[model samples]
Target: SKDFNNSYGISHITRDNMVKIPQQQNSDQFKVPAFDESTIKNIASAKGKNASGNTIDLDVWDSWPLQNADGTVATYHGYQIVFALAGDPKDSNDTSVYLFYKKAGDKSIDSWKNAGRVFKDSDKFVPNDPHLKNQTQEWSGSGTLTKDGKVRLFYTDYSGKQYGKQTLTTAQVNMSQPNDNTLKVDGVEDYKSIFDGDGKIYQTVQQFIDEGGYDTGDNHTLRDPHYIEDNGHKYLVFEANTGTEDGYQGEDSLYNRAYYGGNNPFFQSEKKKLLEGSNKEKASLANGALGIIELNDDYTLKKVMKPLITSNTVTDEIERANIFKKDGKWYLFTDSRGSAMTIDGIGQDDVYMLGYVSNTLTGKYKPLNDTGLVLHMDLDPNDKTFTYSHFAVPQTKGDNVVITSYMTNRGFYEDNHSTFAPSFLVNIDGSKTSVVKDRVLEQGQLTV
Candidate 1:
């Protein structure tokens, strides 16, 4: 029980603790506001001006603001930078990191200007060899502008024979502000794998390969490296799976004895149905975790700390791990799809941003707003218009928190689903959070 309840001095997300987003709700605050085509315009990758001084049009999505060590947006000479996933429209997986910037106070779609791609299109890892290949794509990433003025980046590395094998990778950049309006990336250091999980606390790629090639049903991951600093310490929060020894197995799982434990017949039957199957162990292994690892001063892995929370029987994927301190409470958030969680009252189209709160970084975390349903978007896969990849940006004034996400539009952009949704705010008061219905901003907007 220590492994799931209080392993290594931190609380975990047991089935009994996690709250379920309701199938139907009377409140309109939970809904992600629909797209307003008039609010956004056609956009392209902002890797910067070409050598010939012309614009290059490549679709980009899944972006995050460059931040200070404290998780607030980092700015240089009144310009705020954003790093996003970009690639050709023809291939969905051919992606790389691209740079985009806007004047610090601007929130309009037109204000976002392209700075160009960060790494060469051919950038790839060859182990001991010396070369670059396009097969390796840099996925979602977060950045920080250090006190010494150096730019540090932490991103997911998906490359080579390990195509879908996502690992923690990082690099550094030198920024030059030639003028008040222009911030240039001068030079970037080579990227390297920092922490790919200890295999004691997280499932390693090697174990994933040896156990069997791959399948979404038995998910494995060590990705979405999110950087944060607290009390002069540096850490990264990520998405991963419970290691072989840490995962729940069959009747030993909390789903049977502890989860929703009560005399109520409804939950009693729900418990049995959850573990009902010959492949109970396989079902039990579908655990998604919010893993944390402390970093050395130079940003290398110091030690792999215990997980902040886990979705043992709830879902296999908890994506885009985001954490920040608000009102002395540490909030941890991630997005999940109902398709990955086969529980009752949840549908395949249900998309959710889950939330939890803890007094200390490594302390026990309890679900927020009871059900942990911060924002819900039930999107249909068949629809030409879709939205995904939600990132929360906390504001300085009051308890206002801004949420940024990308949306797919059929009639609007030449490359649909490549632009940001109109930014909106969610008010978080202590453990309770609700979407602010009237405070939406322009597409891809950020305030402080």
Candidate 2:
């Protein structure tokens, strides 16, 4: 499953700033400040093998960062990072998700614990499904820890369905005792589908054409589940195509949308407006629009919000949309798999990170800077070589927001891939929103 055919390259995976907007007059409306060039640091690297000594690639490319408390800095109290890894370094199939733990203040790579792969040799949990039985298939997803310390993992599973039938499923787990590193798997229970049929997470490119009424052709995107929370409500977000008029095909071509509208979960009637617009508008909403689902306490999806963010004419798609409110402003983090334009002196690269800010969560988000290119490898200006930068996620440390991403020689084939330097938060002048800067820490080991 590394979807090589898709424009974005892979699903659920894969950043920069302010220099200027190209053709717009109101440049101040979308300015992203750039991080100091020398500060970019590399935190972790692929071990080239797993705990079992298997020839694997510990490439944490498709990963997310978590802290003990919402908006809290991860410290010795307890910090967990989750990512997916493949058994065969050459191919992405037969992959399993793994967790890594680090205590507060322990910045070294040695302090982290390799928590092992999840859903290993547990076909019994889904005995009826052949896809689950096929250990060689992919089994990776994003996880969210509830306020009660319970872990709910959301992932896509083929489950013997056809190529495009992968289903978005969940499995709940509890943390074991005082050892903040280990998870109690024996108590892990219940793997269920998020939605039914076409509305379901498992979708093929053609399925988007038929169900979402997209005008595209031969594209398959739907995997990589991310959980984002705004205010007190929780939302399940995923990277998907919100159909297009001319069957849009290119990198940076999608929008970031959500499943529920308004802040109140009790407003069930708001769900109908998601797909209620004209065909052209609907298709635009379906393309790169942020697709989200609001959930109940028991995890039942109450309503859907499609095309949360629109007006994107860059990359093939906006992959891994993360939303976290800072001060009174909301910042949207996404990555483009293809080359994008940026202001002069900011540098440009094929793959880059983007940060957008808005006064409200549901509106046209303007780029941090004129270019909207936040964390490109070449942004430093000195390192203008070919670099693959993607999978950018943010963490809060005190008053600063640190961005962590991976720099790789390429995907698969087990070449060179490692977590880049931690980018610090540089608050915009007088604005509630902020930009990022690299901390410039010593490079960690390429292996665990």
Candidate 3:
């Protein structure tokens, strides 16, 4: 059972040891909050006013983590994060799509500009300020926004393939006018190496090898991108980066302009071998954690670390991880867990939990704790199945607030039956040790 004890595989456990807390006797006492499903009745509804301008609910619930609150001296009373989902099967062609929600209590959304557009409509991977016609296509993403105006967004850049020569790209939408044409967006970003018609560029989307070796020119697998910013520097991370390869297979996989009569024209040539792994660790691409790629103020590459925390024993898998600054320390956020299969095959899996791993963004970072579900259906006794990680919204208040929601498994008899119900709020200052439901704060009203 120790497999459910530590952070990753065998290694030098950090100085902070996990404080083991026995499982709860009535662990399944809590109930899932009812949400207003009438809002998102249509899956493909294009209403920009779905969750905007409406106040949602956040229940004040707390769970005693498997270990001490941050793996060390308890600083945050009790940390809380939320779970949400981006439009899976969220098409790359759907230009304008984003996570829009107004917490309960008010008629309007919070007073923030760039807080809304996580996935723009542009076919490009990066958002072009004011270029509504050509900004990065926004896919589903989850992140935390701090009171200090620090916004960390970890989203899968589904449109990254459209970026000509980009791989696993992300951004920090901290401050910017919703329609600001002059504002320049900057932060950690990634892209694939482009090739015209010559040969596959080394480290091209599917060519990056982490083991410090030859870069395969034909590997194109890279997906699930997240980010972290510390000490004025920024980092981009992700899990299971083996981007799927549909076409471009076999000998005719990769091509170059040179293959096309040396005219520098775009053409498909021999199918170069796609790199198998993105992270240097031993874990396969399917099971991995968020890897890091440092960036300068100018948004250039600095270095890439081994991995902050891998998806080993404690977690089902780590995907779309973002960072936050609370009580003066850094916290990593990751949710979105898949459910286990049942013998009868009639079980539901609603896994929605908000988790955070704390440490300096510098050297070998240690996990804050290992034993506990942050926020999910697993925590609530009433969840029949279907919960997951969507995004995290950190209020200007002392504690970081999380947005929790559920997903649909598209069961045999059901077309899709997951919904976003009540959410929970927590004060993440490290001084307290409780996660009480906080009402959704309606900063201002948008008379849409």
Candidate 4:
């Protein structure tokens, strides 16, 4: 179940920049630095919004790079597609995810389709920061569609009627729209058991409470659980919340986000070490770093690996880890700093550079300040302000090597997360990695 590959592909769109605007309380003032007319490709299905008179929202791309205010490249994950239900937004149950597909070498969204649903808001709590709670289609997810045609969707979801918990789970469902996909909730009913220390399952995110206990009528805490199959088993890895533990200090924990913005037990505490202490033997804050744990053959919980890299310790507050093996060494990468993470901590937002570490997966993953292998962008010949590092992954098809990553606009604008540039390709041998920026698209090419 732990079967994993050693190489991956790398993605990067033509460089673009973001124009700095005076900060507004609630506004889309940030702008995409004007690109050469050739660099501005349009998404086919995004026609209406891309039409005249409207300020184009480049932020739609989820994890791609945009230029700096002065024309230098600033990167982020660009928007892949836009999704919404056909019915009223009040039902909360109606949901769907939009997918904007890009043909090979194409820079804009060519044809748009539906992906699937993470979950739609079914009931309203309050139209506050957590707006997706009772709205229509809002949540979404990411996953890999295997050669076997199995689409495993990894998305964030809230608890069923439990009110405040959100967990990222995987499901083999139809890769169609929310209205078309067949949703089976049976598999996740057992998810909450992990909070009780039932040992039957594990999750990266869960609700936390102080002195009294978990589910003490409190809200939820967010987490990012990354799953990868290596050595024939699927292992779940995430940032652990170790409150004031040794080799750890302060409330600089990462990954752990409080739902209603309260004293995220994952933070603001002094209990050192996760899975330790009386009435504590478990985590209480967001340790936005990386930790791995084993699973039983039947996918039961087993053990937690000592963190290889804790959040805030690295150049960017790392999360969403992508682990791969090459030349017998395991290479790990995550979403480094570009835009600020909505999690518990504020990262050092510098898109100009990213961080990296390599090891045997047992330990030895220290700071790799000089790897010089980090990726960035530069749209201008003389500007000095932008770069964004979004999500990245290593994939393979037959004998081809592909390290697919998401690209978004890096500035503060309405369209920043709207759509993504085409998926970047990376040619990887057993040891070296190369960036293939202008490759053709394939059948299973995932740009969204």
Candidate 5:
């Protein structure tokens, strides 16, 4: 009704502020305590015993933890800076993208190591550039630390030509330097294309399913990025999908509100014009949205903005949004699946990690769960087997908040794929958000 002044736009008021919370302690005060798979056994990456013969099931599990490198704030990693997504989840090009660590005082996670296999294209680096050699031939990324700390990666390269969907790349490494074999393996050097989902910068996923509005079973729609900075600015938040019904045309036409109201009739304005408003006022723009890129100053990715967040309102598939900042409040975890779709009454198959609070950081955000659910990992509610319980990138001394058991179960190479559990204690207790428990470390008392 209010179009862009946002009275009821911004995807219908953030889909009416997505609300749904119910998982009232089915015991263990909301589960997340049962992790010690041998301190992440033999260097996590499909975990333990592997020389090739494949069967690591799932090794990556959306990670981006470990801080402290003169920049301070550590529980581990003095030279440590982790990044995952490793092998054989039934061969998605045999998957590879590793760079694990923790050897500088060795606090825990058992002195992690295996700093290898990251963008190997030999010839000493950036050579021939064939999309940084098979790293996420599908999707998976986010590894940060740059402000002179070095090591900055942001991945998701479905190998171009829409082989399976997903495009977004950025690289740089030198975690103090150690492993070397050329092409800068562990200390990687180059890799470009900040955002190019085939159609460069914006539309192109078969032109949003040929402008029918995403849903040809949607697969790798842009892919998880997340890499905030705040203050001076350096955002990159990812995961996309555009075309949400504006002037409705055929094949279930929703064209993400004609590519966010810029009237994307095959990119009508020519250059990368995102959202302006025409075509019946672009159905309030929201198509699984959640995009924001601002880097230029030599950081590349000059400009992009149309979705600060969107699922057209809430949950049809918000997957992984990630944006952290506690105490001052500004969370945004996101991992909502679909079904009666409206936050979640915990039915229609269920899957939630959805939390959303805001004081600033681009404003407008609510639902720290009163019924808006934050961590439902459903071990048994009908067992949707922990539907993508994601969260990691909220650590600043015991205020913790690490989570992952990603897609916990439901086939796809299941055998407990993408496992990672342990860490939670972000109690905000004022505007509501108690996520307590599970931060107990005393096998010798791990340190930061």
Candidate 6:
């Protein structure tokens, strides 16, 4: 079921793997330590630096630290930049991207500062592109500091269409820090409509609608663009779903799998029986994948790649695909919601940061810790510290990696809901990882 011609191998997170996660509360195997209200605060306090004049408040959500082309966390004029997608607390979906910063290595929440919205247009980051007009919001993406001192942003542009559409949009920005307390966002320019999922390699929203998918929430996802350079080549790895051509989605999806030349009669007969049932149509649509594409030097699409991994019969949404090098292996990470899963045992209450390991950038990835369970949060949806968008920020020194995710309840339910959740560290050893219990970082903290 895993090794296919188009697949980079199976990094599928299974119920087997989920059970491997120690269910004991606060255990380091996979659980994120529950929030202690006494210690965690909104990264930006009402009495602190954030005010109406700044235009950026506690609504900050999915975010990524700015890095150089080589992928080291970037520093400009001694401050590290984190580009975050924030929303209006009164209307949570009214979101735009903002730049939040603190002096390099400053861990105190009070040291945090905001540079307002990244674009002159507060409502939309790229209003010029009608094809990918960001009517809904600009979702999270990665940023890199250009050699010329400009910042290049690659984000998902939401169209707010009835069936919904998301496209990879890019822009260049120039930021200025005129004083210790202020970092000015000059303007966002050179905006371009980049890659949206193609119908063959990656499913487009229109393509899904053309089929029978009417699900509103987890229907289409061509987002979370994380740019990385491997072996002198450039690529953007994103979260997406498998298309019909190479995936288990055609009318004969199971038929072909069963009828194909294989030695195992037991397996073949079982797959054949599934086609006689009514679930084939339902099963075909659950193809979530971490898609990869080659990028040219000008940030244009050079090639569409086969997926690094695909969950054909497992889940439909694999959000926030991230990759980094550790020792000599390639580690690909992504966050998945249990509610989006089509499997047993895992459901809506589960939030996971899963990982996979490979030897080369484009090589087949093996799931980390057997099941790929890195950090799991199973909180009541109303829990104020509820988190999502878990990204692994590799520490500058050694094998130390910081896990970062923004609170869903922060700006939505509580005053401080707009910032990052308290982050913790995980030690990645070969193909195994474990959370470091005593080393949880401050809320919104990143390694210096």
Q: For each candidate, what TM-score against the reference? A: 0.88, 0.64, 0.48, 0.50, 0.31, 0.86
Model 4, C-alpha of 39: deviation from truth (Å) = 3.7
> In candidate 1, which residue pairs clash?
46-114, 46-115, 46-116, 47-115, 47-116, 47-117, 48-115, 48-116, 408-417
| Counted clashes in each candidate structure | 9, 54, 54, 77, 18, 6
Note the Cα lDDT for every prediction shown. Answer: 0.71, 0.44, 0.33, 0.33, 0.49, 0.71
Error of 5 at 30 (Å): 12
Q: Give the per-residue Cα lDDT of candidate 5 at 227.
A: 72
Top model number, TM-score:
1
Q: lDDT tens string, model 3, 209-291?
A: 33322332222223345445565666665543211221111222112111112122211111111123222122122223445
TM-score, cand. 3 = 0.48
Candidate 1 displacement at residue 340 in angstroms? 0.7
> Model 4 shows how many backbone clashes?
77
lDDT per residue as tens, model 5, 314-352: 333566667767777677666765452433244555455
Q: Write the per-residue lDDT of candidate 2 for residues 288-358, one digit (tens) a residue.
A: 43456777776767766544443222223566666666667766666654333211232243345566666
lDDT top scorer: 6
TM-score of 1: 0.88
Q: How far is candidate 2 from the true structure (C-alpha RMSD, Å)?
A: 10.7
What does each candidate score in C-alpha RMSD?
3.8, 10.7, 14.9, 14.1, 19.7, 4.4
Which run of 10 residues does model 4 get worst, by summed lDDT?
A: 12-21
lDDT of 5 at 44: 40
Compare candidates 2 and 3 on TM-score and give the better one. 2
Candidate 6 error regions (>4 Å): 1-26, 45-57, 122-130, 215-218, 248-282, 409-416
Answer with 3 or 5, whichever has the higher TM-score. Answer: 3
Query: Roughly what TM-score does model 2 have, to 2 decimal places?
Result: 0.64
